[PDB]
Paper text:
[name] is a member of the TRIM family of RING-type E3 ligases and comprises a canonical N-terminal tripartite motif (TRIM) and a variable C-terminal [name] substrate binding domain. [name] has been reported to ubiquitinate a number of different substrates, possibly in some cases mediated through RNA binding, including RIG-I,15,17,18 DDX3X19 and ZAP,20–22 with diverse roles in immune regulation, cancer signalling pathways and antiviral activity. We sought to assess whether the E3 ligase [name], reported to catalyse the formation of both Lys48- and Lys63-linked ubiquitin chains, could be liganded and repurposed for targeted protein ubiquitination. As the majority of current proximity-inducing small molecules for E3s recruit substrates to the physiological substrate binding component (e.g. the substrate adaptor of Cullin RING E3s),11 we focused our efforts towards liganding the [name] substrate binding domain of [name].
A crystal structure of the [name] [name]-compound 10 complex was solved at 1.8 Å resolution, which, to our knowledge, represents the first published structure of [name] in complex with a small molecule. Multiple sequence alignment of all [name]-containing TRIM proteins showed that Cys498 is not conserved across the family (ESI†). Thus, the covalent targeting of Cys498 by compound 10 reveals a unique binding mode for [name]. The biphenyl ring system of 10 forms π-stacking interactions with the aromatic side chains of Phe523, Phe554, Trp616, and Phe618. Interestingly, structural overlay of [name] [name]-compound 10 with the [name] domains of TRIM7, TRIM21 and TRIM58, for which small molecule ligands have been reported, showed that the ligands all bind at the same site on the [name] surface, which has also been suggested to be a substrate binding interface (ESI†). Interestingly, the rate of [name] auto-ubiquitination was significantly increased by compounds 10 and 11 (ESI†).
Residue numbers in the entry: -1 to 195
Write the structure that this text describes.
């Protein structure tokens, strides 16, 4: 149903922030996945860089190579929106990934494998990543990203969220398994906050 999928994508690309909030889902960070450099706070809604490594209990799902963390729930059907506040001028990333993504080694890095899609702030520049292919984006003064995941018609949209929403990047994928919200923090004081609007 290519025509219907294209129309739906066009509709969501043009939605305002109030309209995106109609698809809001509450995302919670999953302690079992957090790398030891990722500190969690505020009832698991805030991820920040720990200056010293923590000593989290071993778990097969825990990231051991990249300082990343996933949401608690995955999505295989429906439409989902969530927003992440970021501290400005930091190395960090917001994305989505399949549960089957590796949790160990360089293959676990968001956007550097076939199983994940993200936008990333890296050396004050903004890029979109999937399958180890980088796309440079124009800078934004927004300190908030909105992720619109449409499982039913196969796309994810990353919005820069300010007084209005602006497109950062989108991907069309016929997703093959459920998706987790995914997060990367690296620079000192980098912080990703799942907002409650
Ligand atoms: C994916 C991840 O978080 N890792 C842990 C951190 C180090 N690492 C890197 O691959 C990595 C090396 C160098 C930089 C960097 C720092 C400052 C300027 C430019 C690049 C980064 C951001 C990551 C292994 C995996």
């Amino acid at each position: 149903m290519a025509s219907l999928k294209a129309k739906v994508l066009e509709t969501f690309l043009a939605k305002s922030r109030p309209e995106l909030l109609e698809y809001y889902i509450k995302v919670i960070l999953d302690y079992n996945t957090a790398h030891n450099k990722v500190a969690l706070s505020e009832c698991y809604t805030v991820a920040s860089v720990a200056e010293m490594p923590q000593n989290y209990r071993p778990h097969p799902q825990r990231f051991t190579y990249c300082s990343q963390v996933l949401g608690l729930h995955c999505y295989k059907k429906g439409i989902h929106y969530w927003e992440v506040e970021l501290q400005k001028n930091n190395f960090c990333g917001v994305g989505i990934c399949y549960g089957s993504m590796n949790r160990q080694g360089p293959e676990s890095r968001l956007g550097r494998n076939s199983a994940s899609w993200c936008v990333e702030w890296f050396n004050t520049k903004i890029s979109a990543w999937h399958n180890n292919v980088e796309k440079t984006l124009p800078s934004t003064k927004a300190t908030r990203v909105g992720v619109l995941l449409n499982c039913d018609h196969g796309f994810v949209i990353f919005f820069a969220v300010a007084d209005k929403v602006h497109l950062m990047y989108k991907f069309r994928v016929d997703f093959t398994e459920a998706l987790y919200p995914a997060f990367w923090v690296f620079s000192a004081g980098a912080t990703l906050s799942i907002c409650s609007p």
